[PDB]
Amino acid sequence: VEMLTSDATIEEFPEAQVSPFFKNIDLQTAKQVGGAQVGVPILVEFKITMTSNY
Amino acid sequence: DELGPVNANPVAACNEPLCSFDLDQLKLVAVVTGDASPVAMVEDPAGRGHIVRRNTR
């Protein structure tokens, strides 16, 4: 869904953390898609890339 | 929890292969003969080579 920013290769420094098993790189993008008279989503489409642990 | 145990068990063996394919599909490539007894060489419909000899299947 080329709503999305691209990429999947970088070098990461931690700001905050909650899962000791997950290193999320960043919320790569997010756009609230409203829809039209034919129907809704209204939600916030988004994209994330994350290197796990192991 | 199953990927983080990064585990692979590679393929290199026989699949037990030719006993899963029909005999008229197999093609004789070559034959070797010497002191180690005569051995035939045969080709799969999947294009693998095999080596088989008297008493084998």
Add this chain to the structure above:
Amino acid sequence: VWVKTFSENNNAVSIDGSAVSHDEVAEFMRGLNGVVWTPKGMGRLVDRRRDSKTAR
């Protein structure tokens, strides 16, 4: 219930752990040492950690 991983090389140990708070990790870190580290060398084990290729 503790600390997680231990891995040595007969000169240094690179451990991996978990503690109760800013206190027991402070007790543990005090029980050892405290150092101003300077010129670090990058080695192929670091990237094997970035690769996930050495399980940690």
